[PDB]
Structure formats: C-alpha cells, structure tokens
Amino acid sequence: DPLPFFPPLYLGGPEITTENCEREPIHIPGSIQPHGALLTADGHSGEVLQMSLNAATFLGQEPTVLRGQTLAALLPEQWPALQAALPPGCPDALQYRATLDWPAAGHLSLTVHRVGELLILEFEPTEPHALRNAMFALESAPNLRALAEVATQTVRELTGFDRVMLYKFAPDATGEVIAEARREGLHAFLGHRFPASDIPAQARALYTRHLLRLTADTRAAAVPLDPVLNPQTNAPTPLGGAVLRATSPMHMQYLRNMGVGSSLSVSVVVGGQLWGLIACHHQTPYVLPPDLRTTLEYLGRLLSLQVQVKEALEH
Amino acid sequence: PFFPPLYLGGPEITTENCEREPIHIPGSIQPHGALLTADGHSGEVLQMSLNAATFLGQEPTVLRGQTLAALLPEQWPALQAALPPGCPDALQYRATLDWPAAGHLSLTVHRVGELLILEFEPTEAPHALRNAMFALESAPNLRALAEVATQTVRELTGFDRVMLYKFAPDATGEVIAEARREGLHAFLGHRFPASDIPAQARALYTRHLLRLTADTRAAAVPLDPVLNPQTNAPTPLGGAVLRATSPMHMQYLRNMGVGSSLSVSVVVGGQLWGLIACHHQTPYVLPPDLRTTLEYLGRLLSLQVQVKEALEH
Ligand SMILES: *C/C=C1/C(=C/c2[nH]c(/C=C3[NH+]=C(/C=C4\NC(=O)C(C=C)=C4C)C(C)=C\3CCC(=O)O)c(CCC(=O)O)c2C)NC(=O)[C@H]1C
Numbered sequence: 003d004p005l006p007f008f009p010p011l012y013l014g015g016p017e018i019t020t021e022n023c024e025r026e027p028i029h030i031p032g033s034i035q036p037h038g039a040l041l042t043a044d045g046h047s048g049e050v051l052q053m054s055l056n057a058a059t060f061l062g063q064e065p066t067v068l069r070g071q072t073l074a075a076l077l078p079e080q081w082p083a084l085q086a087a088l089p090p091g092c093p094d095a096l097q098y099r100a101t102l103d104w105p106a107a108g109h110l111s112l113t114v115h116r117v118g119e120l121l122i123l124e125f126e127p128t129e130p131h132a133l134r135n136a137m138f139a140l141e142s143a144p145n146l147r148a149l150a151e152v153a154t155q156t157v158r159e160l161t162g163f164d165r166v167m168l169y170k171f172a173p174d175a176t177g178e179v180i181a182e183a184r185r186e187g188l189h190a191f192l193g194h195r196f197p198a199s200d201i202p203a204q205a206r207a208l209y210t211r212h213l214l215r216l217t218a219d220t221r222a223a224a225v226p227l228d229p230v231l232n233p234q235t236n237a238p239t240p241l242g243g244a245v246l247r248a249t250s251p252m253h254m255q256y257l258r259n260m261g262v263g264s265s266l267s268v269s270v271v272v273g274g275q276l277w278g279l280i281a282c283h284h285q286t287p288y289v290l291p292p293d294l295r296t297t298l299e300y301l302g303r304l305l306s307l308q309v310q311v312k313e314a315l316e317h
Numbered sequence: 318p319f320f321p322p323l324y325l326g327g328p329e330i331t332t333e334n335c336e337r338e339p340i341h342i343p344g345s346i347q348p349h350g351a352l353l354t355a356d357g358h359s360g361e362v363l364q365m366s367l368n369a370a371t372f373l374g375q376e377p378t379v380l381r382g383q384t385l386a387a388l389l390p391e392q393w394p395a396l397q398a399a400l401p402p403g404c405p406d407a408l409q410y411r412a413t414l415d416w417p418a419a420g421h422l423s424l425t426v427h428r429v430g431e432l433l434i435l436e437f438e439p440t441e442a443p444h445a446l447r448n449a450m451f452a453l454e455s456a457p458n459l460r461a462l463a464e465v466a467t468q469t470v471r472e473l474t475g476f477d478r479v480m481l482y483k484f485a486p487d488a489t490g491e492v493i494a495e496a497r498r499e500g501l502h503a504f505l506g507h508r509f510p511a512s513d514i515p516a517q518a519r520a521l522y523t524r525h526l527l528r529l530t531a532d533t534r535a536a537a538v539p540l541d542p543v544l545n546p547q548t549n550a551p552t553p554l555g556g557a558v559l560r561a562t563s564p565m566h567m568q569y570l571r572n573m574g575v576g577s578s579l580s581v582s583v584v585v586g587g588q589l590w591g592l593i594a595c596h597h598q599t600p601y602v603l604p605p606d607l608r609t610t611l612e613y614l615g616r617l618l619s620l621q622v623q624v625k626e627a628l629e630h
C-alpha cells in the first residue's frame with residue numbers, strides 16, 4: 003500500500019523498520035557522506051546558509067568565516083557562470099559542474115544545482131578513447147543480451163568494481179540480474195530475481211529523475227548539515243539531487259550484510275520509466291572520482307537509447 | 318543503381334543524375350589527413366594516399382610493402398580484437414599514437430569485409446559536455462531543445478553557423494533552429510527541396526553519422542592504387558571521415574560562401590530525423606577529440622528528440 007512520507011528522524015519521525023519501508027523520506031536525511039562537503043546558498047543574494055560539519059576541512063576555512071561571506075566573494079569566477087547556467091525556476095535535475103583550484107585542498111570538483119530559491123554546492127576532490135570505443139561497440143551489439151554483456155564488461159573495465167550487474171525491472175517492480183561481470187571467486191547473481199520491496203517505491207521514483215547515486219563506504223557515519231533545517235523555510239533541505247546525500251541506513255545495513263563496502267548504480271530510463279539499473283559492488287570502500295563518474299553517466303544515456311533500439315528489434 | 322565512378326570512365330555528375338553519384342567510392346581523401354588500407358589477416362598495406370609520406374614521415378615504397386605488425390606493434394593486436402572478421406563497417410576503433418615524425422596522431426580504423434581502413438590525423442594532449450548534456454535534458458520542449466543544441470555546438474566549436482535541419486516526410490528539409498555569428502544571412506525558417514541531400518546520401522548518413530568538408534577549395538588526394546588489389550574494385554570509403562566530398566556538394570558550399578562544413582546525423586526509430594549542420598566561412602579542421610564530443614551529442618540529441626516528441630504526441 004502506498005502511503006505518504008514520515009517526517010525525518012530529526013523532526014521526531016519514527017525509526018524505519020521492515021514494516022514502514024516505503025515511507026522513509028530518503029530525500030531529506032539532513033546529512034551527507036564524508037568524502038565531500040556541501041554548502042547551501044540563497045539563490046539571489048548568494049548568502050551561505052547551511053554547510054556540512056566537515057566543510058572547514060575541505061575548504062580550509064572556519065565556519066563563521068564561510069557563513070559570513072556571499073558566493074560572489076567566495077567564488078568570484080564561478081558565481082556569474084552559476085547564475086547564467088541555473089536560472090530561477092529551472093528544474094532541480096539540471097546540474098552545472100566546474101573544476102576549482104583551491105589553495106588548501108588541491109583540485110576540487112564543484113557540482114551545483116538549484117532547488118527553488120536554494121543553490122546546493124557539492125565539493126569533492128578530483129584527479130583515453132575508451133568511451134568512444136565503447137560507444138561504437140554498444141551500438142554494434144547484435145541483440146539485447148550481447149548489449150547487456152558488453153555494457154557490464156565495459157563498466158567493470160573502466161571502474162575496477164568487483165561486480166557490475168545489469169538489473170532489470172519487471173512490470174511488478176521485481177528485478178532480475180540479466181547480465182553481470184564479476185571478479186574471480188565471487189558467486190554469480192545472474193538469473194536470480196529479487197522482490198519488489200528490495201528497492202521501495204519512493205526510491206524508484208527518485209531514480210527516474212536523478213540518475214546516479216552511490217555509497218562510497220557502507221560503514222561511514224553521515225555528516226550533518228549545520229544548521230539541519232534550511233533557515234529560509236525552517237524546513238528540511240531537499241537533497242534528492244545531491245550525490246553526496248547520505249544513504250538510507252536500511253539500505254546500508256542491507257549492503258553490509260552482503261559484504262559490500264561500496265555501491266554505485268546508474269539508472270536506465272526508457273519511455274519515461276525506470277527500465278533497469280547499472281548496479282556496481284566493491285568489497286572494500288571505494289571512491290570513484292567525479293570525472294570517471296561522468297563517463298558512467300554518459301553510458302547510462304547511451305544504454306537507454308540502445309535498449310530502446312534493441313527492444314524495437316523484437317516484437 | 319549507381320553510375321561507375323569517374324576514374325572507371327563513368328558519366329560526370331549533373332543535376333540530371335543527382336541520385337546516381339557513387340559518393341562512397343571516390344578513390345580519394347581530403348588532404349588534412351592520410352589513409353592506408355590493409356589486409357585483415359596479414360596486416361599487409363595494400364593502398365595508401367599519395368600524401369602518406371608527409372604525415373607518416375616514411376619513404377614512399379617502405380609503406381606499401383610493410384605490415385601493420387611491423388608498422389604499429391602495440392596497436393596491431395588491439396585492432397585484431399576490436400574489429401573481428403564479420404563485424405559491421407560502422408564499428409570503429411580509435412587510438413592516439415606518439416609517432417616520431419608527428420608529435421601525436423589520431424588513428425581511426427574500421428573494417429569492410431577483408432580490408433582494414435586506417436585514418437591518420439594530427440591530434441593533441443572539460444565539463445562543457447556534461448553541462449550540455451544536463452541542459453539538453455532540462456529543455457522543456459522540442460523548440461527549446463533545438464535552440465540549446467545549436468547554441469551548445471556553436472560554443473564548443475566556434476563554427477560560424479550551426480543549424481538543426483529537420484527532414485519532412487518527403488525529405489523536404491527545414492531549418493528549425495540556428496546559432497550564428499553576427500553578420501551572416503539567417504537560414505532560420507527556410508525550407509529546401511529533398512534533392513539537396515539526395516537519397517543515396519541520406520541512406521549513407523543513416524549508418525555513418527558524421528561527415529565534413531574541411532576546406533571547400535582543397536583538391537582531393539588519390540589512393541594508390543585506386544582499386545583494391547584484393548578485389549580489383551573500388552575501396553568503400555563511406556565509413557571514412559577523410560573520404561573525398563562530392564564535387565557536386567562542394568560546388569553547392571562554395572556558391573553559398575562556405576569554406577568549411579560539418580554535420581551530425583540525428584537518427585530516431587532507425588530513420589534519419591535531422592542533421593546538426595555546421596558552417597564556417599573559412600577552412601577549418603576540427604580536431605578528432607572535439608569531433609568525438611559532437612558524436613556524443615548526436616546520440617544524446619537522438620534520445621532527447623524522441624523523449625520530447627513523445628510529450629507532444
Ligand atoms: C525496509 C526497506 C528495505 C530496503 C530499502 C531501500 N533500498 C534502496 C535501494 C537499493 N536497493 C538495492 C538492492 C539490491 N542490490 C543488489 O545487488 C540486489 C540483488 C542482487 C538487490 C535487490 C539497490 C541496488 C538499490 C539501489 C542503489 C545501489 O545500491 O546502488 C533504498 C534507497 C537508498 C538511497 O538512495 O539512499 C532503500 C531505502 N531494501 C530492502 O531490502 C528492505 C529491507
């Protein structure tokens with residue numbers, strides 16, 4: 003039965019059990035994963051409102067100094083570019099990316115998107131023809147099976163992940179591993195099916211709009227935003243569009259129990275519906291840098307197109 | 318059918334026989350790169366472009382005996398695996414060579430039956446592609462998508478004019494969006510007869526998705542031999558971007574005052590929906606890595622055109 007979200011934990015909401023899976027408001031956890039930092043800022047003035055508690059250690063500045071400046075002063079070269087790329091009223095799915103040379107922290111990748119009147123800024127550390135070669139190989143795959151196999155093998159070669167599966171949704175939202183590339187010694191998941199509650203209904207809706215999410219370390223504690231609520235609204239900060247957003251503790255316990263230290267998945271979206279997932283596992287924690295993740299994002303789109311094409315060749 | 322090419326004493330092309338020019342077998346290439354053909358098994362260099370000596374820095378005869386194994390040691394096994402016998406002519410493999418004579422070359426290979434076609438071009442060596450991809454996806458409708466696409470391509474390439482050219486059901490073309498330098502004519506809204514892009518070239522554009530003319534006044538460079546030794550027949554060059562552009566179409570570009578031309582197929586439901594069409598007033602060799610960006614954009618636009626057309630119908 004579909005039911006509306008509970009309030010999050012920090013607003014006195016209940017703790018999540020196998021009973022109330024579908025009602026966890028996973029888009030507003032009030033916290034991020036510790037391998038990057040996040041700031042929120044007023045979309046018109048550029049006043050800095052919220053920051054992750056670890057921000058001082060990524061950005062090399064005291065909180066009170068950060069919060070006491072506008073983005074115009076903090077990001078003089080990027081602030082006008084942000085404002086042109088992310089105009090008021092734009093969708094929350096639109097992202098702008100730049101690379102910064104920050105004194106204390108080396109090269110940072112900056113990813114920005116806009117939710118209403120809020121700008122959300124994510125900072126992460128950042129670092130030949132493999133993509134072009136893959137694009138052509140995907141297109142020349144003769145059928146859906148060969149496409150799925152080429153796609154899994156390519157992603158594994160690009161990333162070094164211990165396991166890369168193509169997980170396909172059935173009409174009842176159960177899922178099946180229809181191809182996989184895996185490290186020697188791992189047991190096969192190929193052909194196994196899994197019940198619809200394994201990926202609940204409100205995570206499926208979010209995966210249709212925001213096409214990549216990850217869990218870099220399944221044992222890492224989440225880092226709170228400070229303050230936790232958006233001071234504009236005294237309400238929760240929407241983090242559905244932020245790759246840094248903390249992962250549901252139910253999902254992390256599920257992955258730890260499988261022996262997974264690192265998870266990543268890309269959405270495959272066909273005709274406006276979530277067709278499947280490029281799902282990746284690593285046994286140890288593992289951070290895939292932003293520019294490599296971009297390659298996977300591009301492959302997500304290519305695969306969406308090629309899945310349509312291969313399936314049309316099939317009636 | 319097709320007329321024989323000129324160099325096999327076929328008729329010269331006019332506006333009477335637009336449909337019958339064998340644009341895929343011109344026997345020549347554009348001079349900003351070099352092409353070798355080679356045997357699929359032996360790696361034996363069978364044809365070369367008369368200009369190969371320039372790019373490769375090799376005494377002419379040296380090449381036309383040697384083997385790819387010898388000539389490209391690191392690459393030759395990769396090719397063997399990447400382009401297995403029986404693969405499609407559409408499948409391409411690329412690498413960057415740090416080659417003694419020329420700082421860096423791009424190498425592009427595909428296979429047509431028993432022949433490997435190798436293309437060499439100068440090359441080199443950020444977020445504009447990722448930023449463009451998200452911009453295309455958030456365009457609210459087909460019109461805005463067209464506008465974003467043309468603007469994005471112009472910004473990435475510096476081309477004087479970028480158009481989105483859409484085919485009607487009878488192959489009548491219409492310029493539905495345009496991004497252009499100040500002080501050019503506006504082709505926005507204009508329609509053009511189907512024969513401007515004749516049937517045999519629309520078929521080839523459905524399979525091989527990018528073509529260009531780098532300089533509309535440059536002479537083609539012959540293949541030597543012109544005929545493939547294997548077959549004593551013309552080498553198919555339609556999957557080669559270095560392939561000499563139809564002088565009929567090169568006259569059409571000079572008469573418009575265009576010095577450099579490039580387009581990307583937008584393919585939807587197995588059919589040619591439209592072109593990203595690009596113009597430059599002067600000669601312009603777009604480097605391979607930037608062309609790759611446009612090739613990606615072509616696929617992304619193909620996806621988004623279907624998405625956007627579905628939310629009208
Ligand atoms: C009480 C709720 C439960 C629950 C919640 C839940 N699940 C997700 C998302 C995912 N679950 C996945 C499960 C699988 N991984 C596999 O390898 C297989 C099969 C071989 C399955 C079935 C996957 C892949 C995802 C997607 C993300 C990823 O891991 O890469 C969420 C949402 C997480 C978030 O965005 O923060 C939630 C809340 N899962 C249950 O099994 C029950 C107990």
Ligand SMILES: *C/C=C1/C(=C/c2[nH]c(/C=C3[NH+]=C(/C=C4\NC(=O)C(C=C)=C4C)C(C)=C\3CCC(=O)O)c(CCC(=O)O)c2C)NC(=O)[C@H]1C
Pocket residue numbers: 331332333334335338340490492504509510512513514515518528529530561562563565566569578579580592594595
């Ligand atoms: C007697 C045959 C003729 C003919 C042949 C021909 N045309 C092409 C390819 C193209 N023609 C194009 C025409 C236009 N370019 C524009 O900008 C506009 C309108 C504003 C039109 C109508 C285009 C865009 C192409 C595609 C190639 C490109 O991107 O430049 C070929 C094929 C050439 C080749 O692939 O090597 C041929 C043989 N065109 C005519 O107009 C008649 C006289």
